[PDB]
Amino acid sequence: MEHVAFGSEDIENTLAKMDDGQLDGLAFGAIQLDGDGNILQYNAAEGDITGQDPKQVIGKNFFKDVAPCTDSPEFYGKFKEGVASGNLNTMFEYTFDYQMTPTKVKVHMKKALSGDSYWVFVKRV
Template sequence: MGDVLCAWCGALIGQSGVDHSHGICRSCYRELLRIPDLSEEALDGLPFGVIVLARDGTILAYNPAEGALAGREPSAVIGRHFFTEIAPCTSVQEFQGVFREFCERDDASRTFQFTFHFPGGPVQVQIVFLHRGADVAVAIRKRVDPVA
């Protein structure tokens, strides 16, 4: 039995073997599920990264927290293609493949871990996909290191 930490906030969820939602605690998950209903202004105020992608990968929104994480100016990336122009490290099955799959399904969310290869070095992140109308909101947070 080991401690299970929330992959989003780092809070102790419980012990392994105990039922939990995607490795994310209930209160974080509830917050994440609100993202599709938030205005772009509200998205900009969130403390973690959010990118809204059209199904073809065009960036529709990119909040300042994601800009800070990736070292990019949101205004410089909106309207460009995420997988080919902005984050080519994501044009792999583990990210773009999951994205395509998610677009075809009705699942409320999809959660997985990924490593971004930023110019400053690799950054391990937790990713949550959510449907936002016909588009997809991608919530991104630096992974909380498990306490040894």
């Protein structure tokens, strides 16, 4: 059985072997992006943090329309560096504040096993 948590050293392996219901049962927000930042998957925990339905944001561009506050060197910039290098794996604190009460979070971005895909994990702090 899986026992993955925010920050698990092998998180991308566990999540590669999970289905959507399992993604929605995680305690942390979990978003999958393509290399351009378009949203492929968006779990229930993340939608609860951001007060909306995951189905409404699938297909949108994370950095452009959903989370413009993350369009910054420290987040979008680091994302693109990790996409390019094939080694995305970075953790930092951030404040989410577009169309929502400003909320402090810890973020962990990590390359997915599935091709052209990248995870963004989020938890409250």
